Design a protein around this ligand. Structure first.
Ligand code: HEM
Ligand code: HEM
Ligand SMILES: NCc1cccc(OCc2ccc3ccc(N)nc3c2)c1
Ligand SMILES: NCc1cccc(OCc2ccc3ccc(N)nc3c2)c1
Ligand SMILES: C[C@H](O)[C@H](O)[C@H]1CNc2nc(N)[nH]c(=O)c2N1
Ligand SMILES: C[C@H](O)[C@H](O)[C@H]1CNc2nc(N)[nH]c(=O)c2N1
Ligand SMILES: [Cl-]
Ligand SMILES: [Cl-]
Lengths: 362, 362
């Protein structure tokens, strides 16, 4: 029965993949071999070329991503050979180092063995490989609230955070056959962080804000031709509003706008003064400035939207339908200053793609 | 056949209306009379109470409107008695005066006779009763581009604009039986305008920007219980971002951000400087400041979203489903600083409601 779903997804994927790669003649024979492999084994294994192109197609089809112009230059690392937790840890360390690339961030994905019978071989608990811990106990709030439940689960496993506002969570993942995940502290030499300063306002450093250099999303499932790679962490570089308009600004995140207003010298007393807006713009200028000054890749939302316009143009020229999720593509500051705001997008789901999956804690 | 649609919409509307008004006992008899009136005449006439409550329900059900907390205090003017173009003009003048209310804007709707056999009795051509003209001819762009086609149609009818950037369009409407609409210049004594100045930056007045005090949308159809009031202009007060983030900022509108940047003393050369964002915030501060200084009602988007949160709470308490269009409810600056951004809304269409209708020019 699932052989049916699998074979169907296989046909659809191999045909499209090989057509894009100029390999249309090889489809019939490759499909023959896949049909046999499924019958005999219940599954099939992707060639290196298929897996690479599949992961790139999945980024290309990610409706919520403004950064897709660069889909074809994704660096794909095939780690389907891993079997041990040391190998997994070392692969994850390696991904941090190679994606970071001394600041000149390389979009990269590391792909681990896929689910077999719906059974995961490796289950990554982190939301991102680099993320700060969060704590809330009797009135006291420290760190990133979005990390509270994962932080608590880590401290059930014997990890203990220093309870600064920026503790790095350890890597945490579980291997097939193990009842419990294992965790490993990140080597600080691998993790670039950027202090936030402002180009003109010297007091801005008084806020003692910082953020990490590379967002490496590690909790999504990559699905390609019916094969489910539940562990396949990937990264790009940040768009500054993710940090300045959301991570540092949201009330349920670091909630810094009132402190930003004070250091930039404006009152935070009257809605009509638009002090939240002014604070957001200055915080976002600081974030871009800081990353650039330190030589860590970042894109501003205007440049990102201009790149996305080229992605829409390239889709049309290639004769591919564009899909998109307008509610995620607009940036959270000045969205109507981008072309995205002024058009609509078909939010159809096309595979290969990246998918949410249930948390293993919570 | 349309008697079917009409009678059905009638039943649904009268039942809900009378239930909200405490008049549930009177429904059966009122429906009896409506059934007879439809049979004999092809239509039915709303009581003053029904029409008033229907227009209020239509605002309440307007998914794209952030300003609905105040739905029940809509001032409804019943002008179903008008038969002549002088009466229509005078009603429209009266609406401007009474809605404006010397700056303390009263949300108001004036309701004209409804469509009979799908035949309009009065057809209003204006998008808003007060709006600026726009011109584009051989390279030359003047005024509001969104008004170009209506401006051209007016100049086909013998009107001539002064070709300032802020010419007031005349009222223009057509009566049943007339082949052509008529137009009337607005008396300038009726039209409040606000010069845009900034609270701290004195050079801002050099841009010589202004805007009109009251948005009076005059091209939508109000539908209540199956009766179609295609001419029923209504107004609220502005939310400052409509003026500062869209009318004065959009590239296809007045396109002022580059000029704003220059007068506030910042470079407009690098996307990473976020100069468009900074210019937007200062333009929006100026707009709020200017309206307030002149005593003309306006709301900022933070206060408006806080009022909308109370509207959602009141809907729940009343046991009414909330409907909303997230893409229109978020403001165009700092949307993630509002609660609206962080939730979702059911965009179902519920009647009574306001609806688009085809332009009679174009
Ligand atoms: C190269 C730089 C990149 C930039 C600047 C970028 C930008 C973004 C942004 C701003 C978001 C919205 C995030 C949020 O609001 O929470 C996003 C979503 C997304 N991006 Fe990209 N992206 C990049 C690369 C990548 C890569 C390499 C992949 C995968 C190979 C990817 C897949 C996605 C996906 C799946 C989402 C949606 C996540 C969800 O539904 O929660 N992006 N991207
Ligand atoms: C009292 C102050 C009011 C405020 C501050 C307000 C605010 C707004 C805003 C900001 C929009 C979005 C406009 C755009 O993006 O083009 C809007 C849409 C709307 N408002 Fe309100 N509004 C108010 C009163 C009213 C009244 C009195 C009515 C009708 C009785 C109304 C009906 C609507 C409708 C129908 C739309 C959607 C128009 C469309 O689909 O194009 N509003 N409102
Ligand atoms: N549980 C899945 C889940 C929940 C929330 C966010 C998310 O990913 C957001 C995301 C994904 C990929 C990105 C790539 C680059 C970038 N700058 N931001 C990015 C942000 C994934
Ligand atoms: N052709 C229908 C059409 C097209 C575009 C906009 C519109 O109305 C926008 C609108 C409607 C009512 C409003 C009431 C108050 C306000 N501040 N803005 C408001 C804005 C109506
Ligand atoms: C078609 C596209 O979604 C369009 O730009 C919408 C989006 N959101 C909006 N929101 C508001 N309040 N007003 C608008 O005119 C628009 N335009
Ligand atoms: C559910 C609700 O639409 C939610 O706030 C979405 C809206 N738009 C977004 N857009 C982006 N880029 N990122 C987000 O996290 C969200 N949140
Ligand atoms: Cl993030
Ligand atoms: Cl307007």
């Amino acid at each position: 029965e699932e052989k049916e779903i699998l074979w169907n997804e296989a046909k659809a994927f191999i045909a499209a993949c090989y057509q894009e790669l100029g390999k249309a003649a090889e489809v019939k024979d490759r499909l023959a071999d896949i049909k046999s492999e499924i019958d005999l084994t219940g599954s099939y294994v992707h060639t290196k070329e298929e897996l690479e192109h599949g992961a790139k197609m999945a980024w290309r089809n990610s409706n919520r991503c403004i950064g897709r112009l660069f889909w074809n230059s994704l660096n794909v690392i095939d780690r389907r050979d891993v079997r041990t937790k040391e190998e997994v840890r070392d692969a994850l360390f390696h991904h941090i180092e190679t994606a970071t690339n001394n600041g000149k961030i390389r979009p990269t994905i590391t792909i681990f063995p896929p689910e077999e019978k719906g059974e995961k071989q490796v289950e990554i608990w982190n939301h991102q490989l680099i993320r700060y811990a969060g704590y809330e106990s009797d009135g006291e709030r420290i760190g990133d609230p979005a990390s509270c439940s994962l932080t608590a689960a880590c401290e059930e496993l014997g990890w203990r955070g220093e309870r600064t506002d920026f503790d790095l969570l350890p890597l945490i993942f579980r291997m097939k056959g193990d009842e419990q995940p294992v965790w490993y502290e990140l080597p600080r030499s691998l993790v670039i962080e950027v202090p936030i300063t402002h180009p003109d306002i010297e007091a801005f450093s008084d806020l003692e804000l910082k953020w990490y250099g590379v967002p490496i999303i590690s909790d999504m499932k990559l699905e390609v031709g019916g094969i489910h790679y539940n562990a396949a962490p990937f990264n790009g570089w940040y768009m500054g509003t993710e940090i300045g308009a959301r991570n540092l600004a949201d009330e349920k995140r670091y909630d810094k706008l009132k402190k930003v207003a004070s250091v930039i010298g404006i009152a935070a007393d009257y809605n009509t003064d638009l002090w939240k807006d002014q604070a957001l713009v200055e915080l976002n200028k600081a974030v871009l400035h800081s990353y650039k000054k330190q030589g860590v890749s970042i894109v501003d939302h205007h440049t990102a939207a201009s790149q996305f316009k080229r992605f829409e143009e390239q889709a049309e020229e290639a004769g591919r339908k564009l899909t998109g999720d307008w509610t995620w593509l607009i940036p959270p500051i000045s969205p109507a200053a981008t072309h995205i705001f002024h058009r609509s997008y078909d939010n159809s789901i096309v595979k290969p793609n990246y998918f949410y999956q249930d948390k293993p804690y919570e």
